[PDB]
Scaffold this active site. Sequence first.
Site, mmCIF file in Angstrom:
data_model
loop_
_atom_site.group_PDB
_atom_site.id
_atom_site.type_symbol
_atom_site.label_atom_id
_atom_site.label_comp_id
_atom_site.label_asym_id
_atom_site.label_seq_id
_atom_site.Cartn_x
_atom_site.Cartn_y
_atom_site.Cartn_z
ATOM 1 C CB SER A 87 21.733 57.339 53.611
ATOM 2 O OG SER A 87 21.617 57.228 55.017
ATOM 3 C CE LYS A 122 18.343 56.139 50.991
ATOM 4 N NZ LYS A 122 18.657 57.431 51.671
ATOM 5 C CB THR A 123 19.063 61.887 50.125
ATOM 6 O OG1 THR A 123 18.168 61.318 51.090
ATOM 7 C CG2 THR A 123 18.255 62.537 49.013
ATOM 8 N N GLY A 124 21.694 61.081 51.214
ATOM 9 C CA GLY A 124 22.570 60.746 52.320
ATOM 10 C C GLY A 124 23.150 61.990 52.967
#
Length: 259
Positions: free
Chosen positions: A40, A204-206
């Site tokens: 992501s 922002k993560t994933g």
Amino acid sequence: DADFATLEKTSGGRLGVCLWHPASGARYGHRMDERFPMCSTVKFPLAAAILHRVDAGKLSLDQRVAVRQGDIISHSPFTERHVGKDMTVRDLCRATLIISDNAAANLLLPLIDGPAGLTAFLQAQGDRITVSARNQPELNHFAPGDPRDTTSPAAMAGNLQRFLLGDVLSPASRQQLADWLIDNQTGDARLRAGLPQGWRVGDKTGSNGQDTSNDIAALWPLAGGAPWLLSCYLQGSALDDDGRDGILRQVGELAGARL
């Protein structure tokens, strides 16, 4: 750059970190040029490509995109409420960033000519490593030797510089992009949980739900000054999501001792 090797042993798999201070040139990290699956985190250059097209007059944050039932996939908590109507591009950008709305990313991608256009945008801005090839959910696929939907810790740290601190975007677009990352909702147990007091974090993560968790962030000093950039990718770990979050937290702790 020795604490990261010790931390990588705890994780299993491959840990990629890049801590960069553009104002002073200081750089710390581990496997900074290796390729890791974006997951992501590809939504951060996706939002920047949207804002860049908006700044160029070829797109507007207030234009609306229709949402149909077929567009809805797993983990799309905002776009699933608008089936049969439309949503503004700005709200689609916010949803895909702060809560990682998966369908919102699939609706933003055609506006910049899909993943091929996102890669062409990244190459024009100076990123010759990151490759965006697929949309959700198949972009989470990864295999060594397959560069599709991959980046490097140094490349993504540089993208954080270009889009948040550089002049790639307008002052209004880059401040809106920073405000989105600051408003992120999925990183409380990751880098934010290990970073020290006195720094504003936008990130922002994933995650792939089995062995891969990523988190890229910008670190603004609350007492004024130049910010740091921190990219972190953990692929093929033997720990689950909670364990990988602990590794991402310890990366924030190691980075905090170098600020």
